[PDB]
Amino acid sequence: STGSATTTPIDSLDDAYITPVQIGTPAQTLNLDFDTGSSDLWVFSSETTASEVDGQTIYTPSKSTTAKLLSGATWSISYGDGSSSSGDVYTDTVSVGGLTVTGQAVESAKKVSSSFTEDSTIDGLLGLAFSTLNTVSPTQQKTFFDNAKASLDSPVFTADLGYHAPGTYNFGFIDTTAYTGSITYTAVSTKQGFWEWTSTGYAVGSGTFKSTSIDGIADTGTTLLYLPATVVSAYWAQVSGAKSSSSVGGYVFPCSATLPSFTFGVGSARIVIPGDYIDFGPISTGSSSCFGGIQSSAGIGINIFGDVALKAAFVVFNGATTPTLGFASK
């Protein structure tokens, strides 16, 4: 089997991408944030505290003839940005782009943190990291991909995120018309539960490529590119007037600037992020200070190849017995 679904930016900045997901019988379609940095499929629901729902579409398990409460199971998650959610668990039928999994754990939120309530466009998350990170207790549950992978034509999914435009998540096949050149594959460590890999270095604009190992994670659920402070300083030094602002929370730059590109290495291959992809717009409405799309990871503990980087590539998440990642230009 295969599946193919369009993923759409939630706003004009590509802050996140939403993909429609069918849950239950009859289907209830919710728009979920596919997140290769986490491993829970959780949704706003009829059980979510009413004051914490503000415009999201909810899953109502009592209206699904295939829903079954997973007795005794609870979940609770905290994300790298400080947000969180928790609740109970059903199993139900879940379909993405024509690919159907029966008995998928659907984690129904009883509580969500304010950042989720305040984003009416995201009805939940669909985790695509390794199932070892799934938070369901006392019996950990499998991700949608893990449940589907034996049925897929090939045990892969691909992320083809758009810049200011829709893109595609495919399951079970590699669309050879969706990228240019060849896909360069690179090793993955699953020791932390992430799609963790080592970039071979970087360049700023038309500058020389610096060969240096940068360990980080491919994370569709993180908006920006978080890299070591040395690399980030080298980038922003090429933008007149850019500076790190402690009060704003990162590098800002004059909105009048033209940003240079940023290149990252995948083996001997090179992925070029155009400068425009690094512009996240005014820090507040009407400001002439703009927020940068490349930021320091120093306060995180891990480098994160988020959407800024991934949207410049066609990305293969190869879930073979020994997983690997593939990157192509497009």
SS (H, E, C) the chain: CCEEEEEEECCCCCCCEEEEEEECCCCEEEEEEEECCCCCEEECECCCCHHHCCCCCCECHHHCCCCEEEEEEEEEEECCCCCEEEEEEEEEEEEECCEEEEEEEEEEEEEECHHHHCCCCCCEEEECCCHHHCCCECCCCCCHHHHHCCCCCCCEEEEECCCCCCEEEEECCCCCCCCCCCCEEEECECCCCCCEEEEEEEEECCCCCEEEEEEEEECCCCCCEEECHHHHHHHHCCCCCCEEECCCCEEEEECCCCCCCEEEEECCEEEEECHHHHEEEECCCCCCEEEECEEECCCCCCEEECHHHHCCCEEEEECCCCCEEEEECC
Query: Where is the domain boundary, 174, 191, 220?
Result: 174
Residue 148 shares a structural domain with residue 195: no
| 121 phi, psi to nearest 5 deg | -85, -15
Return d(Cα 124, Cα 94) in angstroms, integer: 13
Known catalytic residues are 35, 199
Asked if 129 contacts 115 with a C-beta cutoff of 8 angstroms, the reply is no
Asked if 239 contacts 159 with a C-beta cutoff of 8 angstroms, the reply is no
Dihedral sign from CA coordinates of 146, 150, 156, 157:
negative
Query: Where is the domain boundary, 131, 147, 174?
Result: 174
| 298 phi, psi to nearest 5 deg | -55, -35
Query: Where is the domain boundary, 174, 202, 231?
Result: 174
Quote the tokens at residue 320.
């073979």
Residue 245 shares a structural domain with residue 325: yes
Return d(Cα 231, Cα 234) in angstroms, integer: 5
Residue 141 shares a structural domain with residue 200: no
Dihedral sign from CA coordinates of 102, 108, 112, 117:
positive
Residue 145 shares a structural domain with residue 201: no
Q: What does this entry list as its resolution, in Å? A: 1.0
Residue 154 shares a structural domain with residue 218: no
Give CA 301 to chain center in angstroms.
18
Residue 304 shares a structural domain with residue 240: yes
Domain CATH for 151: 2.40.70.10
Residue type at 176 in one-letter notation? T
Return d(Cα 7, Cα 277) in angstroms, integer: 17
Quote the tokens at residue 147.
């449940």
Distances (CA, A) of 305 to 136, 172, 273: 26, 23, 12
Return d(Cα 225, Cα 275) in angstroms, integer: 13
**All residues at 6 or more sequence positions from 78 whose CB lies less than 8 Å from its CB, including other chains:** 84
How long, in residues, is the chain? 330
Asked if 167 contacts 7 with a C-beta cutoff of 8 angstroms, the reply is yes
Q: Count CA atoms closer than 13 A to 181's CA, side-chain side.
A: 13
Residue 152 shares a structural domain with residue 186: no
Method: X-ray
Paired residues of 4 in beta bridges: 170
Residue 16 shares a structural domain with residue 157: yes
Residue type at 76 in one-letter notation? S
Nearest 5°: CA angle at 21, between 160 and 136?
100
Nearest 5°: CA angle at 149, between 155 and 122?
105
Residue 19 shares a structural domain with residue 56: yes
Residue 149 shares a structural domain with residue 245: no
- Number of domains making up the chain: 2
Residue 304 shares a structural domain with residue 245: yes
Distances (CA, A) of 259 to 132, 162, 262, 273: 39, 19, 9, 11
Could you report how far apart the first and last alpha carbons of the chain are, in Å? Answer: 25
Residue type at 284 in one-letter notation? S
**All residues at 6 or more sequence positions from 290 whose CB lies less than 8 Å from its CB, including other chains:** 252, 253, 254, 255, 257, 279, 280, 281, 282, 283
Distances (CA, A) of 203 to 105, 119, 273, 305: 42, 35, 10, 15
**All residues at 6 or more sequence positions from 68 whose CB lies less than 8 Å from its CB, including other chains:** 90, 91, 92
Q: Residue 216: give the domain boundaries.
A: 175-330
Distances (CA, A) of 116 to 14, 111, 120, 183: 16, 10, 8, 35
β-pairing verdict for 225-227 and 294-296: parallel
From the number of C-beta atoms within 10 Å of its C-beta (0-12, 13-18, 19+), residue 38 rates as buried
Asked if 123 contacts 29 with a C-beta cutoff of 8 angstroms, the reply is no
**All residues at 6 or more sequence positions from 232 whose CB lies less than 8 Å from its CB, including other chains:** 251, 294, 295, 296
Residue 183 shares a structural domain with residue 168: no
Q: For the chain, what is the radius of gyration of the CA atoms?
A: 20
Return d(Cα 189, Cα 181) in angstroms, integer: 26
